[PDB]
Amino acid sequence: VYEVYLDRKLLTLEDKELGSGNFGTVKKGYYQMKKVVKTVAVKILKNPALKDELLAEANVMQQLDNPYIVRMIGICEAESWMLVMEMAELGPLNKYLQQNRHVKDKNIIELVHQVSMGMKYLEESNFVHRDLAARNVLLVTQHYAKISDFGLSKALRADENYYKAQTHGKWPVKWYAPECINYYKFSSKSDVWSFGVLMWEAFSYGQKPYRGMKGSEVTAMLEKGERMGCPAGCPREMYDLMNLCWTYDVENRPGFAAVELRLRNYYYDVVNH
Ligand SMILES: c1cc(CC2CCOCC2)n2nc(Nc3ccc4c(NC5CCOCC5)n[nH]c4c3)nc2c1
């Protein structure tokens, strides 16, 4: 793929892992809030660099408030450093669709439209996601999605509308727009390209994009005018949207306002019927 404070006491962990990886691991558990318990997902560090990513990440989530954006609870220093987030019970979109091949097309339009609303709100909030991928969209129900995974995300300086990475740390290049690859500039619009790839994954029931290919070759294919083909079952109007998200010229590519609305209407055309 890749080429605030809390009483540790008020919090139980389970030997039930919700993904993991480089940093450490994510685990299930729950937190005693005001009256009740909240079921939670907790990102734990395997322990210097990691601990500032986590704080930047928490500080980003701290700032975001939207129904299609996963909610931070807070953080906790104990045997390890931990980020505590409200649990999306059904989990990753890609792994869901992989396991439930018979989820109806209308259902898929519903879920991607929701991501689009999440992203429309980020764009308006002047944050860039920088990891927008099926693997990081989480299902609360079959019919309710939230965006997760803000480990690479960034609040945009007030003078600029892009973030300039300096050093390519390990990057999900198959989701990255050409400007990210060439000029390391990441914007709302870059995330639109990622949304395009995310849409493609969704309608392919969670198949990996550009299968069989390296970022080397993907990057050659995109430069050669070439894009991924329409997935079995996808509606024409939706493959038109994917493609529009894959506009090479950042200037000419649609923003999240536009994408959100276009999806809104198509869903409502499908719903009404
Ligand atoms: C914030 C962060 C994360 C970790 C996320 C952050 C984004 O990257 C992935 C980790 N999660 N994970 C959840 N809920 C959840 C439920 C079940 C699974 C699950 N169950 C497997 C069972 C076997 O077949 C595959 C899925 N895997 N992950 C899951 C996550 N909710 C959240 C909220």
Residue numbers in the entry: 347 to 349, 363 to 406, 411 to 636
From the paper:
Spleen tyrosine kinase (Syk) is a non-receptor tyrosine kinase expressed broadly in the hematopoietic lineage and an essential component in leukocyte signal transduction. Syk binds to and is activated by immunoreceptors Fc-epsilon (FcεR), Fc-gamma (FcγR), or the B-cell receptor (BCR) in the appropriate cellular context. Syk kinase inhibitors have emerged as promising therapeutic agents for the treatment of autoimmune diseases such as RA.
Here we describe the identification of a potent, moderately selective, and orally bioavailable small molecule Syk kinase inhibitor based on a novel triazolopyridine core. Based on enzyme kinetics, CC-509 is a mixed competitive inhibitor with respect to the Syk ATP binding site. For comparison, R406 also blocked Y525/526 phosphorylation at comparable potency (IC50 value = 0.72 ± 0.66 μM). This data indicate CC-509 is a cell-permeable and potent inhibitor of cellular Syk kinase activity. CC-509 inhibits FcεR-, FcγR-, and BCR-mediated signaling in disease-relevant and primary cell types.
